């Protein structure tokens with residue numbers, strides 16, 4: 001399968017979530033930001049690159065967070081915890097960014113695939 005990596009950026013005990021702007025099916029819904037691994041890249045290479053491109057921040061990539069998600073027959077979606085080395089995140093690509101605490105994770109308007117990670121995200125914040 002092709003891998004899509006996503007980052008759980010936790011700063012000051014809150015989590016960064018990112019509101020998609022495209023495609024139409026997911027626009028307005030919220031996700032862990034990331035994107036597709038390209039040939040030759042490690043998971044950490046790809047995820048750091050994507051979060052530089054998408055958020056303008058330099059992160060260190062940490063442990064896995066929650067289960068792999070089988071997006072479709074081609075693609076596997078994997079989250080990693082990341083931590084902010086430097087920068088403040090800005091939405092280059094996304095409609096909006098938000099910092100959420102444990103009390104907001106369950107109720108958030110997630111993109112379907114990411115919902116699997118809700119307990120794992122609540123735990124990471126607590």
Ligand SMILES: Nc1ccn([C@@H]2O[C@H](COP(=O)(O)OP(=O)(O)O)[C@@H](O)[C@H]2O)c(=O)n1
Pocket residue numbers: 004005006026031032033034035036050071077111113114
């Ligand atoms: N946290 C995320 C990130 C991507 N995805 C899915 O993974 C696919 C690839 O993600 P993407 O479009 O952000 O990838 P790039 O265009 O950033 O490389 C998309 O179709 C998303 O629906 C997801 O379900 N959850």
